[PDB]
Amino acid sequence: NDTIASQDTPAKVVIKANKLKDLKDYVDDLKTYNNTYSNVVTVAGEDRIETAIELSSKYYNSDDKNAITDKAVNDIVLVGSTSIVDGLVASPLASEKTAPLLLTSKDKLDSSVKSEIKRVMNLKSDTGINTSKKVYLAGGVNSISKDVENELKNMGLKVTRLSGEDRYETSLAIADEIGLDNDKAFVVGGTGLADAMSIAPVASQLKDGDATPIVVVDGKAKEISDDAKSFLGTSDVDIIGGKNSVSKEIEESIDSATGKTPDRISGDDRQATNAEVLKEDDYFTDGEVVNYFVAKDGSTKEDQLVDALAAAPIAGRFKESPAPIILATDTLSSDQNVAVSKAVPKDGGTNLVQVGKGIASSVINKMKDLLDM
Amino acid sequence: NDTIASQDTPAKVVIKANKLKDLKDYVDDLKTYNNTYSNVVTVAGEDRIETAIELSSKYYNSDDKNAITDKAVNDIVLVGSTSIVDGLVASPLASEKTAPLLLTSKDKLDSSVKSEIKRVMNLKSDTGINTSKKVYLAGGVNSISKDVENELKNMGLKVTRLSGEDRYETSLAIADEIGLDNDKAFVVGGTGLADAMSIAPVASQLKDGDATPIVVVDGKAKEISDDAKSFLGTSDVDIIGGKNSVSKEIEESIDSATGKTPDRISGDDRQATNAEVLKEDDYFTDGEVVNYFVAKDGSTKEDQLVDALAAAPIAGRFKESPAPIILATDTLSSDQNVAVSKAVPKDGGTNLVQVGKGIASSVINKMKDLLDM
Amino acid sequence: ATTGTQGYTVVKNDWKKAVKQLQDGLKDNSIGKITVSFNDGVVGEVAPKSANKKADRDAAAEKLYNLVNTQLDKLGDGDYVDFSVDYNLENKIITNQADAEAIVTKLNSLNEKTLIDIATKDTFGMVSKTQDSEGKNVAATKALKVKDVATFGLKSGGSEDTGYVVEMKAGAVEDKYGKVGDSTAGIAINLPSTGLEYAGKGTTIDFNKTLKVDVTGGSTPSAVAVSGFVTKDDTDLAKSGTINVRVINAKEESIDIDASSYTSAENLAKRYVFDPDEISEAYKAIVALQNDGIESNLVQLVNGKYQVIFYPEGKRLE
Amino acid sequence: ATTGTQGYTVVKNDWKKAVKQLQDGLKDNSIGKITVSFNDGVVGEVAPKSANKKADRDAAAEKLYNLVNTQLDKLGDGDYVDFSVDYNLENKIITNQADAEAIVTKLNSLNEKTLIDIATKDTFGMVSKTQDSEGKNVAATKALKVKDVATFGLKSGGSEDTGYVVEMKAGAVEDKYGKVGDSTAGIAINLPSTGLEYAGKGTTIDFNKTLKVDVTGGSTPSAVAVSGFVTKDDTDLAKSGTINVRVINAKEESIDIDASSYTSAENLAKRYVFDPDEISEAYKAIVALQNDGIESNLVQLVNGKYQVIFYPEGKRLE
């Protein structure tokens, strides 16, 4: 008529009531407050570089429940902290290679970043650095200088740079390194920074083991490049962004090359496009999206989207239910509000990860409301 | 390899395509534009009086698909056009009695209203006025004057006035006429005009034949009236509105009287409370509410909620899927946006009824977006 | 004995009262054996050498107290005392003449309680043994009360050794069951032929089940019976078996929701972390009990109140 | 009905729901006959011609309403309507297939309630049919729950005429009752042979008494039994008999002592004059219930609150 309690318990809580309904309500509130005092994490540093390091330390070579990998890594994906344009499609690479996406100053490898590289790859004096330890520099010399590449080579690591003359060839270098083994690919426009960040988590979803590649194409050109065409071969393509990011001309160009009709996920702005990525059934199932990430949108400054770039691989591999990234600095859009409302089950969300500083509190509060947190 | 066409057809449309996918898409768009061109109706006149008449002519003694009754009526519910307070709980009365809820000027029965009364009840010189032709005046003399009551009596109609010294006694007079036969009742605060309008459609839902009564209680009093206590007896009560409309003191008062724990449906404002009425499972099922009404919220002027009053009986009986009333003059709240998103099926809404003139276009456009119309 | 099992958890401050109940239990013979454990290890057995002798039961109770009094009174953080109590509530006697009379008074305080009302032309009830001159049932003089079905008092031959035993003796009733003005003959009231002895027999008289009427047959009743002593155990556990009691070094937080000031479920959550399964299992048993009529060992009616028991993991950070 | 007898006293505002309970009672066959009286004089009898036929039970319910609806709806000061209700909760059936399934689910929500736990060396419980190679009892695979012992569902021959009747079918259990490591063979568990039908029997299933285990002997057990459906009256009044319903032209004064403002017993005395015996009999039944756990029809647990009913003589002067 009682249970036998643990010896370490600080108290014997006996909750009594004349009315079983008043007991029910007290025990129900107790259940709620007990569970509610536990689940909403921020991952941010004073710098964008520190935010990426915080992400790497939490999700790669980490025992965290939602870590992408628990062992030391063999691959790093490095991106210029200022150059969002160059590293834009690097998220699915980081996902498939089981690699943190780190940010570095252009001229000098940051000591914080050097320390995280040695930590996450487990580089040591008494142990051999075999030909499998690799660092991918996603960008050209104007994003990650030669000085930084040499400093990584100097520690004894294989350093491959995935780059080209522009954002487009740079994206293919990165997309080529990624598979294209599931007969599927993503396409984004040159200025579609927020759009690439909206789809990055999805691309980063491994489907039968492989990530899906993202290719940046000249959105105002008459045709996509022969390299883009060759890479895409005869695969299904999903275009992310409106006509101002990837023109009608480019959609047709992809159709003609692949022989398959490409899909289009887009809105009137970046927050709307982000909402649409969530609404898309191939990427997320209705009433089955419990895990969520939030990052700045780039409205205040475009380069501030690096937080989403670094978070996207993680969101794609998160637990057994991939997470989207909601793009929002000062405010959530009405479309994002509706999208999350239809994506989340009737029961609410189970993980909310804020990435970076300067995201206004209203945004997080609103996300918590929609997810019943 | 062709079908035999109707003789009255204006054309033979042969839709051809080299790619079966382009045909599929054309036939799919054709299906969509064909089906979508039809169900978004406005019901409004130059006055609030005319809006109520428009509602009566469309839903009572009418061949309309969502009409409450198709035959001549035996009961009218009349309300002072300015006095929303007096006729506040009259919607479920109008629903259960199968009666239009009309508005009248206080001093002179409006000619348009007189004409609608004769029309909807089918009053004539060659026919006997048996003891069943009735007009319920929901309100005291400062809402519907004696002059107007006598003008209805002069026609040869039985005129019963459901009134008291205030909104509270007036509400019980109305609730008593409805009858509490399902062991269930609704309660709203004296200043909870918008709240009474939010629940009016629900109360107006006939459940096992009967509407559910709404009672107005002094929300800042220490206890509800002996009349309210007596009327409520031993029934289940659902309180609509926050603590600023119906204090915690009054909730306890109802509990103590009925012996049953009352429910509370409420938000931080009127639009939130409206959203909550839609979210409540007893009143509407998630993914099964296809029919919707829209009316002003009363933010600009409280008396403008008479449109919702006159619309609520209709919304409650609408087809076999009851409709809510979304309260919005210039803008929909974020809560209303979310509520409709979760209420409507993935496939969208099937009927949208705008009630009155001064509802901004943004509101209607937003409702159409949320309902995929 | 084992964390999470069915049994009692006494806090340190109430160790004396709990041990007194076990002592009283040894003295009244409810308890045949108490295996005592300090923390996880067994340290002693308390059992009267011969149950029929008073001195042996008192010796067992004194040994029990002597064994556990420092261990309980000086119980440190993380320490506990477990009692595995072999009982047989059926061997309970009432070994104090004062306690036996306290139970006889408990039973005598029921004497005026009506079991069956007098019959009327409208309602079935108590009627007379013989019909009137017209062959119809006539109402009985008085209602059927508990004073009419059985008398109480301690049994003869009692002593502290063998025990005093409160005893029921079925009375006699000439009155029957029927409607007034009805021609069908009144039904005989079946009196208690079993469950006639109660020594506080390691259990408490369940008055909801004891001395209760059972009408059989409906629109035409055919049989009426009255139960003797039907008990409910000091515990929810069966009339005989083994119970686990555990004393712990924890403070008792009595949370009465009917109170003016109690710890809100919010502040309770803020001060301690609770096992989610302990909460949800208790909640599910409450829901089942509320929506359906289903009773459970997790939720129990104790001293006119529904109770749940929680042993939080620890205090919350900050 | 007769003033002071056991039965329900409905106030005028609730006449419809009370009459609905009598109509439901006629429809569900709880009620075999209702003798109706306007004030003190009998005016009509309502009784289904054949309880076996639905139409006859509905006809009885319609006639009941038609007879009393104007008398009740227009009831003046000093007027009342009495219903003498010959009932038999044992004959009550579920007339709606939705309500029958609602009772089957009430029973199915018990399927996971453990009746007997798995045995241990310390505690008696469920053991296997056959002993190990050394002749000792080995623990059973699963605990004995309600899903083991009986299955539920509406009867095969159910209809609106006969009623949908949730029916229990006794199962089969190969497992027995004992201690683990013991040489004595396990005791056979007696399954329900009576109370196999539950028609919503003018009662609600008593889950403390329904599908409950009765071990006889404990530490040395000799028999184990499991009861079938054992109901409790929705009113504390007997499973068969007659109850009085009376509607009166009075206002309902709900006095909740836990309320913020309620009539203080002083101001209640100041507003009305009460029958002294009505108070003292209720008080005696309360004292007995408080001190000993003694239940009475005068004081009852209804919706998590103990309640008493008073009908004052009239208002007080001044």
Three-state SS for B121-187 is HCCCCCCCCCCCCEEEEECCCCCCCHHHHHHHHHHCCEEEEECCCCHHHHHHHHHHHHCCCCCEEEE
β-partners of residue A4 are: none
* Residue D59 to residue D43: CA distance in whole angstroms: 17
Residue C140 zone, left/alpha/beta (φ > 0; ψ -120 to 50; rest): beta
CB contact under 8 A, D256 and B253: no
D49 in contact with B, Cβ within 8 Å: no
Both structure tokens of A137: 């520099």
The neighbour count for residue B290, using CB atoms within 10 Å, is 20
* Residue A348 to residue A327: CA distance in whole angstroms: 20
- Grouping H, G, I as helix, E, B as strand and the rest as coil, residue D156 is coil
Amino acid at A286: D
CB contact under 8 A, C268 and A13: yes
The neighbour count for residue C197, using CB atoms within 10 Å, is 15
N residues, chain C = 318
CB C221 within 8 A of CB C116: no
**Integer CA distances (angstroms), A131 to A115, A116, A120, A122, in order:** 21, 20, 17, 14
Both structure tokens of C251: 């403070």
**Inter-chain CB pairs, C–D, below 8 Å:** 147
CB A220 within 8 A of CB A247: yes
C253 to chain A nearest CA, in Å? 5
* Residue C238 to residue A186: CA distance in whole angstroms: 68
Amino acid at B329: T
CB D26 within 8 A of CB D46: yes
**Integer CA distances (angstroms), A194 to A37, A197, A274, B35, C77, in order:** 33, 5, 8, 35, 57
* Residue B21 to residue D4: CA distance in whole angstroms: 84
* Residue C297 to residue C306: CA distance in whole angstroms: 11
Cα A38–A44–A47 angle (5° rounding)? Answer: 170
Q: Enumerate residues 111 to 130 of chain A having a beta carbon within 8 A of any beta carbon in chain B.
A: none
**Integer CA distances (angstroms), A63 to A67, A69, A116, C262, in order:** 7, 8, 16, 41
Give the strand pairing for A291-295 and A263-265.
Answer: unpaired
Give the strand pairing for B101-104 and B134-138.
Answer: unpaired
**Residue among C137, C224, C120 at smallest CA distance from D4:** C120
* Residue D125 to residue D51: CA distance in whole angstroms: 45
CB B237 within 8 A of CB B187: yes
Q: Using a CB-CB distance cutoff of 8 angstroms, which residues of chain C are in contact with residue A28? A: 283
* Residue D59 to residue B338: CA distance in whole angstroms: 50
List chains adjacent to chain C, taking adjacency as at least 3 C-beta pairs closer than 8 Å.
A, D
Give the strand pairing for D125-127 and D176-178.
Answer: antiparallel
* Cβ neighbours of residue A350 closer than 8 Å, sequence gap 6 or more: A39, A290, A291
CA Rg value for chain C: 25
Residue keyed to tokens 């004595």: D184
CB contact under 8 A, A18 and C258: yes
* Cβ neighbours of residue B77 closer than 8 Å, sequence gap 6 or more: B87, B90, B93, B94, B97, B99, B100, B101, B102, B136, B138
CB contact under 8 A, C305 and A5: no
β-partners of residue A276 are: none
CB B155 within 8 A of CB B133: no
* Residue C281 to residue C4: CA distance in whole angstroms: 12
Helices and strands in chain A: count of H runs, count of E runs: 14, 13
* Residue B235 to residue B269: CA distance in whole angstroms: 27
* Long-range own/partner contacts, residues C50-58 (CB < 8 A, 24 or more apart): C51/C91, C52/C161, C52/C162, C53/C161, C54/C95, C54/C159, C54/C160, C54/C161, C57/C26, C57/C27, C57/C28, C57/C29, C57/C95, C58/C27
CB C80 within 8 A of CB C1: no
Both structure tokens of B88: 């506040």
* Residue C3 to residue A323: CA distance in whole angstroms: 39
Could you tell me where the DSSP H helices lie in D148-302? 265-271, 276-292
* Residue C160 to residue A28: CA distance in whole angstroms: 50
The neighbour count for residue A128, using CB atoms within 10 Å, is 7
3-state helix, strand, coil in chain B (%, to 5): 40, 15, 45
D208 in contact with A, Cβ within 8 Å: no
**Integer CA distances (angstroms), D57 to C12, D28, D53, D91, D197, in order:** 63, 8, 7, 13, 21
Q: Is the dihedral of CA C129, C131, C136, C140 positive or negative?
A: negative
CA terminus-to-terminus distance, chain B: 35
Q: How many alpha carbons lie under 13 Å from residue D217 in its C-beta half-sphere?
A: 10
Kindly state the greatest CA–CA separation across chain D.
89
Give me the phi and psi of C198, to 5 degrees please: -150, 110
β-partners of residue C203 are: C233
Both structure tokens of B246: 């119906």
* Residue A351 to residue A354: CA distance in whole angstroms: 10
Of A9, A15, A36, the CB nearest to C308: A15
Of A11, A16, A18, the CB nearest to C312: A11
* Residue C149 to residue C142: CA distance in whole angstroms: 13
**Residue among B231, B230, B248 at smallest CA distance from B239:** B248
Give the strand pairing for D300-302 and B134-138.
Answer: unpaired
CB A173 within 8 A of CB A223: no
C208 in contact with D, Cβ within 8 Å: yes
Technique used by the depositors: electron diffraction
CB B118 within 8 A of CB B144: no
The neighbour count for residue B126, using CB atoms within 10 Å, is 4
**Integer CA distances (angstroms), B64 to A79, A251, B69, B196, in order:** 65, 47, 9, 27
Whether there are 3 or more C-beta pairs closer than 8 Å between B and C is no
CB contact under 8 A, A34 and C273: yes
C196 in contact with D, Cβ within 8 Å: no
* Cβ neighbours of residue A219 closer than 8 Å, sequence gap 6 or more: A189, A190, A191, A192, A241, A244, A245, A246, A247, A250
Q: Enumerate residues 236 to 295 of chain D having a beta carbon within 8 A of any beta carbon in chain A.
A: 258
The neighbour count for residue B223, using CB atoms within 10 Å, is 20
* Residue B152 to residue D52: CA distance in whole angstroms: 54
* Residue A199 to residue C318: CA distance in whole angstroms: 39
Kindly state the greatest CA–CA separation across chain B.
79
β-partners of residue B237 are: B185
Mutation for testing the B interface, residue in A252, A256, A285, A341 having most B CBs under 10 Å: A341
Q: Is A209 exposed, middle or buried (0-12, 13-18, 19+ CB in 10 A)?
A: exposed
E runs forming strands in B211-330 = 214-217, 236-240, 263-265, 291-295, 325-327
* Residue D89 to residue C78: CA distance in whole angstroms: 55
**Residue among C111, C231, C125 at smallest CA distance from C171:** C111
E runs forming strands in chain B = 40-43, 75-80, 101-104, 134-138, 158-162, 184-189, 214-217, 236-240, 263-265, 291-295, 325-327, 351-355
CB D306 within 8 A of CB D299: yes
Give the strand pairing for A75-80 and D7-11.
Answer: unpaired
Amino acid at D208: N
- Burial letters C91-108, b for 16+ CB under 10 A, else e: bbbbbeeebbbebbebbe
* Cβ neighbours of residue C113 closer than 8 Å, sequence gap 6 or more: C145, C146, D285, D288, D294, D296
**Integer CA distances (angstroms), A317 to A199, A207, B13, D161, in order:** 14, 10, 50, 61
Of A12, A24, A36, the CB nearest to C9: A12
**Residue among A339, A329, A332 at smallest CA distance from A297:** A329
3-state helix, strand, coil in chain D (%, to 5): 25, 30, 50
Could you tell me where the DSSP H helices lie in chain C? 15-27, 54-73, 97-108, 146-149, 265-271, 276-291
A22 to chain D nearest CA, in Å? 9
Query: Going edge to edge, which strands form the sheet with A214-217?
Result: A214-217, A184-189, A236-240, A263-265
* Cβ neighbours of residue B51 closer than 8 Å, sequence gap 6 or more: B43, B44, B45, B103, B306, B307, B310, B355, B356, B357
Could you tell me where the DSSP H helices lie in chain A? 20-36, 48-59, 84-87, 91-96, 111-121, 146-154, 167-177, 193-203, 226-232, 248-258, 270-279, 306-317, 334-343, 361-370
CB A295 within 8 A of CB A307: yes
**Residue among B188, B194, B201 at smallest CA distance from B228:** B188
The neighbour count for residue B165, using CB atoms within 10 Å, is 8
CB contact under 8 A, A14 and C78: no
The neighbour count for residue D103, using CB atoms within 10 Å, is 22
CB D294 within 8 A of CB C207: yes
B266 to chain D nearest CA, in Å? 23
CB A236 within 8 A of CB A258: yes
Both structure tokens of D217: 């002997």
Give me the phi and psi of C247, to 5 degrees please: -95, 140
Q: How far out from the chain centre does Cα C97 lie?
A: 20
N residues, chain D = 318
Q: Is C149 exposed, middle or buried (0-12, 13-18, 19+ CB in 10 A)?
A: buried
The neighbour count for residue B321, using CB atoms within 10 Å, is 13
Kindly state the greatest CA–CA separation across chain A.
80
* Residue B372 to residue B25: CA distance in whole angstroms: 18
**Residue among B320, B314, B295, B317 at smallest CA distance from B306:** B295
CB A203 within 8 A of CB A214: yes
CA terminus-to-terminus distance, chain C: 34
Q: Is B168 exposed, middle or buried (0-12, 13-18, 19+ CB in 10 A)?
A: buried
- Grouping H, G, I as helix, E, B as strand and the rest as coil, residue B59 is helix
